[PDB]
Symmetry: C3
Subunit: 456 residues, 3 copies
C-alpha cells in the first residue's frame, strides 16, 4: 500500500499575495492540482492534504479528492506531517511526503521514486537532484556504498560539503509505521520541528536511508515567488505543447504559445505563435488558429479557421471562419460553414449553417436561421435599460447594411431589411421592410462648406 | 562536374499527416525547397529528385527545377538512389546525396563538403556532426590518420563505440561512377538496401572514405515529427531575422517575430515583437510595424506606420498610417499619406493620396479619389445577393459619419453626404445629399422609460 | 572624489543609421541614458560626455545632466578623453571612462569597480570579463601576483595569448591626475591615439594596473549593430520583468512581455504574454492585462481589466474594463467602473463613473456624465472639415444603438436618443429625441429579389 501526504499549509510571503501559495495557477490550474495529478500515479490508498493559511480556499479546490487535516500554525514540516498521524498512524505501507509547491514533478518520477524505495527496502528515500549551483540547498552526504548518511543544510555546511552537487528536493518516501514512530520521538523531545529530523533518527538506528535522483533538475523546482512561478509556467508550456506536437499538431512557436493543461487538440491542427487556449477547450482536426486568437472554454470543430479572434464559452461547428478581430461572447453557437468577419461581435446567439456576418456587426440575443446575410454595420438591439429582448431571424433573411434591428421583432424566412433601416416591428416571410429618409440632393451647395477645396 | 540526388520519397509517419514529409513548411516554403536552395550552391550540372508517396504534390512544388524519378515502394536509401541510375550512370563527377528533410543545412556547408571531397580525392565523403547525445545515430569510426573505417548503427554498437560523439548526418558526396558500380554490386547481392552499404564496399576495396564535420550541429536536423519541424522553424527564424538586423532592421524581439524566407525589408525599418510577414512581402525604408501586425503578399512603401493591422495582397504607398485593428483585404491600393484608423476594413478598393478613413468604416469595391474624408461608421454597400457593384468617389468628397452608400452610385468631386444618410443615387460634383429623418424631441417623456434614474 | 567621462562621439556604421550610435533605444530610452544611470551609482562629482557625430541630438538627450565636450573628428578613444582635459586636468580623484554603447553595465558593477580600484590603490583598473570565445577582444595578460602586465589585441596576439579568456571591456577607472599626465605624453609623442596606450605608459613606470572582472559577461556587451541592440533589449527585458515579479507581479511569459524601463506596476498585477507597456505608464494593484494590450504614457488604476486593447496618453480609474479590441486615444479619462467593450474608440473625452459603451462606438471630443449608456454602433461627430466641436452628455443619458450625434449638441441628464436617430440639435434633460424614417413593409416583394432561395 502507498499513502500520500501533500503539504499545502503555507502562505508564501515572497509571492506578495493573500492566496495560499499552492493555489497560484500554472497553465490553468493551481500548483496544488498539478502535484495532486502527479501523486495519483502512485495509486495511493489514502491521500491527506495538510492545510493552514486560508484552509477553506484549498479545501474548495480539492473538495472530494483528498482528506484534510489542519495545522493551526507554522511549526515546520515535521509538525505538518504530524497532523496526518490520527489518520495514518500504524498503517503498513509506503508514504510519499510532497509539497504543493513543486508543480513540475511528474507522476513518472513519483512512481520511479516509490519503486526505488520498495525495491531497495529503504526505511526512507529522499528524492534528490543535482545542480552545479547548490548554494542554499541541503546537501546529500552519501557514504561509499551510496547510502545517505545525512542531509546538511547550507549554514552548517563544511567547505568540502558545499562542493556537493546532489541536493534534497524536500520530497520523500517513508515506511509509514516507522515514519510516525520516529516523529513522536522527535515531537516528545521538542519550537519548530522538521521532517529532515526523521532522517537523523534513522541514522541513529542504522535503518536504511536511500536517495533516488531526478534525471531532470527543473522538476525539483519549489515555487516561492512569481519569478519561480513563471519558470514553472515555461517548463509546463513546453511540456504541454510537446504532447501536442507529438500528437500531430503544428506550432509556429511552441515556446510562445499558451495552451492550458486540459485543452484537447486533434491531429493536423495548425497553430501560429501567440495563440491562447484556456480551460475546457477542444479543437477539431485540421483547424487553423492564427496569431492573437484567444479561446476559453469553447468547442471548435474540424476544418475551421480562427483568425486573430476571441471566443468564449461557445460552440463553433465544422468549417467555420471567424476574424480577423471578431469576438464570439458567451453562449453563442456558430453552425457549420458560418462566416464571421472583422469587427463583428456575436453574443448569446445561435447562428444557423452558412450564415454570414462579415463586418462591423453586433448580433446579441438572436436566434438566426441558415443562409442568412448581414450587411456591414448591422446592429441588433436587445436592451432597453431594463428588459433584454430576443430577436428571431428565419432562414435566407437578407439584412441590409447599417440597419438597426430593435428586439423583440421577428424577421420571417426570406425577408429583407432595406440598408440603413431602423426596424421597429415584425417583417412577415417573403416581405421587405424599408425604414429610412429619402435622399435629397442640393446642387452647388458644397461650395460653401469647409471641406470644399476652394475653402481649403 | 557536380550532381545532386535529393531524397523526397518518404511519407513521414510520425508527422501524422498525409503530406509528403518534405512538403511541410518552414518560414513559408517546404523543407524540400530549403534543401533545393542549399543544393544550388554546389552548381550541380544535374539535379534528380526521388519521389514516392504522393509524387504529384512534390512534382508540383519543384516543377521545371529538377528531373524526377520514382521509387514505387520503400526499399531504402540505396534503392532510392538506384532509381537515379538511368540518368546518372557512368558520368564522371561528384554526387551529393541529401534528404529533403534536412532543411537547415546551408549552401555554404554543402560547398565546403564538396570542396573537402574533391580536395582530399575521397571516393566517398560523409557529412558528419558532433553531439554530446549521440544515442540513436550511426557513429563514425575513424582510424588514427582520421579516415573513416565504418559507420556503426546504435543497435550494433559496442559500448566503447556508443561513446563516439561524431555522427552520420545521412548526407554524402560520392564519386559518381563508383557510386553506381558499388550500388549494383549491393543490388545484385540483395529486401531493403542502404546507401551506407556503399561505404562498406569502399572499405573492402580500400578506396578513400572521408568525413567533413559540420561546425553547427543544428544544421544536421532531420525532421521526422512536428517537434523537430518547430525546431527547424526556430533556427530558420533566427537565421532570417539575423540577416535583417545585419541589414539595418531593428527587432524588439527577433526570437518572437515571424518573417518568411523571401520577405524583403529595407534598412531602418523598425519591427516590434510578434509581427508576421508572409510570402512576397516587401517593406520600404524607415517603416514601422507594431506588435500584432500581419502582412501577406503585399508591398509597403517607405515611412509608413502599420499599427496592429492585417494587410493582404495589397499595395501600400509611402507615409501611409494603418491601424490599430484595421484590415486591408485583397486587391486594395492605399495611395501616399492615406490614413486608415481603427476598425476599418478596405476591400478591393483603390484609395487616392491623403484620403482618410479613421473609424468603423467599410470601403468595399470602391474607386476613391485624393483628399477624401469618411466619417466614423461609413458603410459602402456593393453586394445585393447576386450582383457586386462598384462605387466611384471623386476627389475631396466628404462622406458624413454613419452614412450608408449603396453601389452603384457616384459621388462627384467635392460633394458631401450628410451624416446618417442612406445614399441610393448619384450625387453631382459640388452638390450635397441628405437622406435622413428629422429629429423630433418630446419633453418629459424619458421619465417613463426604464433608463431613467427614478425607475432605477 | 570620482569623475566620469562618457564616450558618445561615434556614429555606428554597422547600425546603418544616421543616429548617433548611443541614441538607439533599449526598453524605451537610449543606450546612452542607460549608461548615464549606471554612472550615477558612483556619485561622480563631474560627469563629462564626449560628443562628435550629430552632437546636438545627444546634447538634447542629456541636456542639464552632464558637461559636454566635442571631438571634431574620430582620432580614437585617447583623443576623445583628451577633449575632457580642460575640465578634468589636475584634479585629484578616480575617473571612470565608459562608452555610451555598453547599456547593460550596472551601477552595482561600476561601484564594485571603483571600490576595487580605490581599495587596491591601482593607478588604472580595467573592467574585464571572461568568455570562452575571446576572438576579437584585447586579452588581459596578468603576471603571477595577478597584476595586469598588458592588453594584447587579437592581431598582435601570440597563439598562447589567444587562449586567454579574460578580455578588456573598454571601460576603466584611472587616477585622474595620472590619466592626463600620461595622455599628454602619448599625445606629444603621436594619427589616432588610444586610451589603452596609457596602460603601457603605466607599465613603463611600474605604476599599479589592476583588473576587476564582471561576474556576468553579458554586461560587457558593446553594441555595434542591430543584432547586438536586440541582445541588449532581451537582457534588459528579463532584467525589468524580474524586478516586477520579485515585486509581486505575475507574468505568463516574462521573456515575451515588453515593459519600458520606467513603467511602474503595483503588486498583484497579472500580465499575460505579449503585453506592451511604454513610457510613463503606471498600473495599479490587482489589475489584469491580457495578451495584445498596449499602453503608452497612461495611468491605469487598481482592479481594472484591460483586454487586448491599446491605450495612449490617458487615465483609467479603478475597476474599469476595456476591450477586447478597443482603442483609448490621447487625452481620454475613463472614470471608476466604466466599461468600454469591443471595437470602441474613445478620443479626447472624459467619461464619468459606471458609464458603458460596449460596442462599435466612437466617442470623440465629448464630456460624458456618470451612468450613461451608448447602444452598439453609436457615432459622435465632431469634425466638419474645419471646426472641431464638443458634445456634452449629462448623467444617465441613454443613447440608442446606431445613432449619429452631431456636435455641438447637448444631451441633458436622463434624456434618450432613439436607436437609429440622427441628432442635429440639443435634447433637454428628461426628454426623448427621435430622428429616423418609419418602417414600411411590402408583403411578397422579396420574391423578386436576388437573395430569395427560389432565385438561388
Ligand atoms: C448593392 O447591394 C444592395 C442594394 C440595395 O438596394 C439597391 C439594398 S436595399 O436593401 O436598399 N434593397 C434591396 C434590393 C436588392 C436588390 C435590388 C433592389 C433592391 N431594392 C431596390 C429599392 C427598394 C427595395 C429593393 C441592399 C443591398 N445590399 C446590402 C448588403 O445591403
Ligand atoms: C461637426 O461635423 C459635421 C457637422 C455636420 O452638420 C453640422 C455634418 S452634416 O453632414 O450633417 N452636414 C454638412 C455640414 C458641414 C458643415 C456645416 C454645416 C453642414 N450642414 C448643415 C445642415 C445641412 C447640410 C450642411 C457632418 C459633419 N461631420 C462628419 C464627419 O460627418
Ligand atoms: C430593446 O432596446 C431598445 C428598445 C427601443 O425601443 C423599443 C429603443 S428606442 O430608442 O427606439 N426607444 C426608447 C424606448 C425604450 C423603452 C421602451 C420604449 C422605447 N421607445 C418606444 C418608441 C418611442 C420611444 C420610446 C432603444 C433600445 N435600446 C438601445 C440599446 O437602443
Amino acid at each position: 500500500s502507498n499513502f500520500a501526504i501533500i503539504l499545502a499549509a503555507g502562505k508564501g510571503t515572497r509571492m506578495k499575495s493573500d492566496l495560499p501559495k499552492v493555489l497560484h495557477k500554472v497553465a490553468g490550474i493551481s500548483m496544488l492540482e498539478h502535484v495532486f495529478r502527479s501523486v495519483g500515479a502512485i495509486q495511493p490508498e489514502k491521500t491527506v492534504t495538510v492545510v493552514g493559511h486560508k484552509a477553506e480556499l484549498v479545501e474548495e479546490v480539492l473538495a472530494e479528492q483528498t482528506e484534510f487535516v489542519t495545522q493551526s500554525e507554522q511549526l515546520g514540516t515535521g509538525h505538518a506531517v504530524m497532523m496526518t498521524e490520527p489518520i495514518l498512524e500504524g498503517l503498513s505501507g509506503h508514504t510519499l511526503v510532497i509539497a504543493g509547491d513543486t508543480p513540475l514533478i511528474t507522476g513518472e518520477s513519483l512512481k520511479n521514486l516509490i519503486d526505488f524505495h520498495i525495491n531497495h527496502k529503504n526505511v526512507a528515500t529522499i528524492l534528490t537532484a543535482e545542480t552545479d549551483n547548490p548554494f542554499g540547498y541541503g546537501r546529500i552526504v552519501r557514504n561509499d556504498n551510496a547510502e545517505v548518511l545525512r542531509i546538511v543544510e547550507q549554514k552548517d555546511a563544511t567547505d568540502f560539503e558545499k562542493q556537493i552537487k546532489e541536493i534534497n528536493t524536500g520530497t520523500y518516501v517513508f515506511d509509514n509505521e516507522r515514519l510516525f514512530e520516529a516523529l513522536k520521538n522527535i515531537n516528545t523531545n521538542n519550537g519548530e520541528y522538521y521532517i529532515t529530523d526523521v532522517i537523523g533518527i534513522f541514522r541513529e538506528t542504522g535503518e536504511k536511508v536511500g536517495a533516488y535522483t531526478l534525471k531532470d533538475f527543473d522538476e525539483s523546482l519549489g515555487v516561492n515567488d512569481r519569478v519561480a512561478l513563471a519558470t514553472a509556467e515555461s517548463v509546463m508550456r513546453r511540456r504541454i505543447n510537446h504532447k501536442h506536437m507529438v500528437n500531430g499538431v503544428s506550432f509556429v512557436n511552441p515556446e510562445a504559445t499558451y495552451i492550458d493543461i486540459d485543452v484537447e487538440i486533434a491531429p493536423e491542427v495548425q497553430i501560429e505563435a501567440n495563440v491562447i487556449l484556456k480551460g475546457q477547450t477542444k479543437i477539431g482536426a485540421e483547424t487553423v488558429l492564427t496569431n492573437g486568437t484567444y479561446v476559453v472554454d469553447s468547442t471548435i470543430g474540424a476544418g475551421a479557421v480562427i483568425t486573430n479572434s476571441m471566443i468564449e464559452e461557445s460552440s463553433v461547428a465544422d468549417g467555420v471562419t471567424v476574424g480577423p478581430y471578431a469576438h464570439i461572447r458567451p453562449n453563442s453557437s456558430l453552425g457549420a460553414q458560418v462566416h464571421i468577419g472583422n469587427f463583428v461581435e456575436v453574443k448569446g446567439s445561435s447562428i444557423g449553417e452558412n450564415t454570414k456576418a462579415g463586418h462591423l456587426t453586433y448580433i446579441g440575443n438572436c436566434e438566426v436561421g441558415s443562409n442568412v446575410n448581414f450587411g456591414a454595420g448591422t446592429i441588433t438591439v436587445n436592451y432597453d435599460g431594463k428588459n433584454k429582448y430576443k430577436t428571431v431571424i428565419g432562414d435566407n433573411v437578407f439584412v441590409g447594411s447599417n440597419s438597426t434591428i430593435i428586439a423583440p421583432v421577428e424577421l420571417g424566412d426570406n425577408s429583407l431589411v432595406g440598408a440603413g433601416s431602423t426596424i421597429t416591428k415584425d417583417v412577415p416571410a417573403d416581405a421587405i421592410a424599408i425604414g429610412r429618409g429619402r435622399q435629397i440632393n442640393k446642387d452647388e451647395y458644397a461650395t460653401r462648406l469647409p471641406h470644399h477645396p476652394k475653402n481649403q
